[PDB]
Structure 1
C-alpha cells in the first residue's frame, strides 16, 4: 500500500496473508480475504505449487496468539484466467480445516445483492504490500482510501475491461494498492467489490482490480460444490 495508514490492529479480521511456494524461486506473498471459515478469496496470479494462509495478523513479523497458520488443500484458479490479458484474475483457496472465529479472525460473506458498482465513490483497500517502488513489503497491515475512477482512466491498460474490472485510484495522488497487495479486497461501504490485480511497475495510479460482481456466479459455484 502506497500513501496509506497503518490499520488498527485486527480491525479487518477477514484479511489473509498468503505465502506462496514455487518450485524454482523463493516464497512470494499476496493478500486475500476469508469469505467462509474454510475459503479465502484472492487473485489467480497468486497461485503456486502450495500456499499457506496466516489469519489474525497485524505485524506479520511478530507471532501472536491471534495468528492462525492454515494449510491450503486445494487452489481453485478461475478456469479462464489469462496470463496475457490478465482477465479473470480470481482464485479461491480451500483451507484444510475451518478457521477458528475470534475477535481477530472472522469471515466477510458477500451480501445477497451483486449490483454493478459504477465510478465515483471512495473505497478502501488493505495489504502488507510494498509501500513504494523501491520499498519492501510492510511488516504491518496498511490501508488506503481510493477513488473509483471512470473506465477511461484505465484505458492505457490495453487489456482493461470495464465489465470485468474496476479502475481504482485518482492519478493526481500517489495513493495506491501495489505489489504484494495482490489478492486483497477493495471494500466499498464495508462490502468487498474488488480484488487487487495489477497496475504500473512505477506505481502511478490508477490500478486494476477484479470486479467481484462479475464473478459472483463462479464464486457461488465453487463454494456450493466444495
Structure 2
C-alpha cells in the first residue's frame, strides 16, 4: 500500500503548477480527458496554470514532458469554499497535447452509473494535496476502498450524492494529489478533494458521475 508505478504507465496523468495571485506557485494533480482539456479540483484554482504531461519523476525534467499552458480555468460555478461541494474544474489548454506513448487521454465511457460503496479503486499521483509535505516525487499508486457514506459522517457537509467516501481506516496516508483521478476498473470515478488535516482515512472525493452533464456542457462550448 504505497507503490511505485512503472514510468509512463498512466499517460493521462497531469502535474499542475498554479501561479497564485500573490506570486508564489502551488501544485496539484489532474488528468487529460481530451487533447486540450485537463480535469482537476476547483480548490486548485489560481491566477494561471501550466500542466506537465508525460512525467514520472516530477523533479527530473525529461524528453517525454509536454508543458502546456492553460488558457482558461472553468471552476464549477457552485463551488463552495466552506462545504467544499462541487470541487471540480476543467482546464482548457492553449494547444492540443501531442499523443505519444507517454502522453494520452482518458476519455469517459459513454455510459456510466452511480458507483456504490464496496468496490476497490486505485489512485495514482505525486502526493500534492492537503498541508502535509509529500511524500515522494515519482508517480505512485494506492488501492482504496469505497466506503459507506456513514464512514464520512464526521465531515460536516458530506453528501453521498455529490461525494465519494474513500479509504478504510482499519486497513489503510497517500491518496494521490488534489485533483487527481480515482479509478475504478479503469474508469475515472472520482477526484481527490479533501480529508482530515492529519490525513487519516477516509477522505472525500468528488463523485464524477454527478458532474458528467456539466463536464460535457463545458466541452461542448469550448
TM-score by length of 2: 0.96
SS in 1 for 2:216: helix
The answer (yes or no) to whether the contact 1:128–1:180 under 8 Å persists in 2 is yes
How many correspondences in the alignment? Answer: 222
The answer (yes or no) to whether the contact 2:123–2:176 under 8 Å persists in 1 is no
Cα–Cα, structure 1 residues 134 and 102, in superposed 2: closer, same or farther, change >3 Å? same
Deviation string 1:44-88 (CA, Å, 9 cap, x unpaired) is: 000000111000000011111110000000000000000010000
Deviation string 1:145-168 (CA, Å, 9 cap, x unpaired) is: 000000000000011100000000
The answer (yes or no) to whether the contact 2:73–2:91 under 8 Å persists in 1 is yes
Structure with greater strand share of residues: 1
Q: Distance in 1 between matches of 2:45 and 2:65?
A: 22
CA RMSD in angstroms, aligned pairs only: 1.7
Farther off after superposition, 22-31 or 139-148 = 22-31
The answer (yes or no) to whether the contact 1:128–1:141 under 8 Å persists in 2 is yes
Deviation string 1:202-223 (CA, Å, 9 cap, x unpaired) is: 0100000000000000000000
Deviation string 1:97-151 (CA, Å, 9 cap, x unpaired) is: 0000001100000001120000001000011116997543421011100000000
Q: Distance in 2 between matches of 1:180 and 1:25?
A: 25
SS in 2 for 1:153: helix
Cα–Cα, structure 1 residues 96 and 215, in superposed 2: closer, same or farther, change >3 Å? same
Cα–Cα, structure 1 residues 133 and 26, in superposed 2: closer, same or farther, change >3 Å? closer
SS in 2 for 1:187: strand
SS in 2 for 1:149: coil
Query: What is the CA-CA distance between 1:23 and the residue it aligns to?
Result: 2.1
Structure 2 match to 1:62 = 60
Mind listing any 5+ residue stretches in structure 2 that lack a counterpart?
A: none
Deviation string 1:165-221 (CA, Å, 9 cap, x unpaired) is: 0000001134xx658710000000000000000000101000000000000000000
Query: What is the CA-CA distance between 1:30 and the residue it aligns to?
Result: 0.3
TM-score by length of 1: 0.94
Farther off after superposition, 105-114 or 93-102 = 105-114
